[PDB]
């Protein structure tokens, strides 16, 4: 029914200040349905990514006005009312699938006419493991009550799309792991330094990507804020 669970957008879109802009997410599955509580983000260069709609409509707070979200028919749809150059960025839409997230993958928008944050999640820049080890890496969550939050963790692997991996939710300890990452990830948190984090182990090339944090809860705007992003190499 759902394990081969597919979310497909528009490979790119063009566009130019003030036109508007209609992003589509549609879901293998059947519909796209309220229960998918869609998010859309948006990635920007050097992997640096902003939430703008969760739960399938809510724009998050300080997103412009410009961005909306619905359902419409059977897809979930992301309008820019009067695009501007700084759109000009990979949009990914995020379907919930009962026990996972799974992202669409990725629209990339380009905006002809080219030329701090209260929350912040802290990722370190760059780790480098041998294969066949482990690594671990931490996102301490500044500027925002972190036990009220989960972290969700996030890849994405070089030049392609985002791939969820688990989440912990610091309060219950409750741990989700996607079945892509049950044996590649152990997630942990401590409050008192509001730190989570991901141990990957069983290291290959493969492993080579960017890991990202970000944050989510019950009915909130998941991934509204999101880490750096960490590049792991693996490599003899
Ligand atoms: O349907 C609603 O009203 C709200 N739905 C959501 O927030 C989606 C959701 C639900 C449960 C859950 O464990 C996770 N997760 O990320 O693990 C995400």
Redesign the pocket.
Known sequence: GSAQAVVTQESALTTSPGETVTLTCRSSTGAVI??N?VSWVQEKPDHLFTGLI??NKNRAPGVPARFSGSLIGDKAVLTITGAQTEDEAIYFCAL?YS???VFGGGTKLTVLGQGGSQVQLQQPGAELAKPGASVQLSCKGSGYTFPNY?M?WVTQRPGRGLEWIG?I?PNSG?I?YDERFKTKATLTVDKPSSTAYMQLSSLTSDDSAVYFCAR?????I?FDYWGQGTTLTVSS
């Open positions: 309220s229960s509580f969760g739960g919930w026990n996972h997230w989960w969700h989440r939710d409750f989700r989510g809860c019950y009915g909130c998941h």
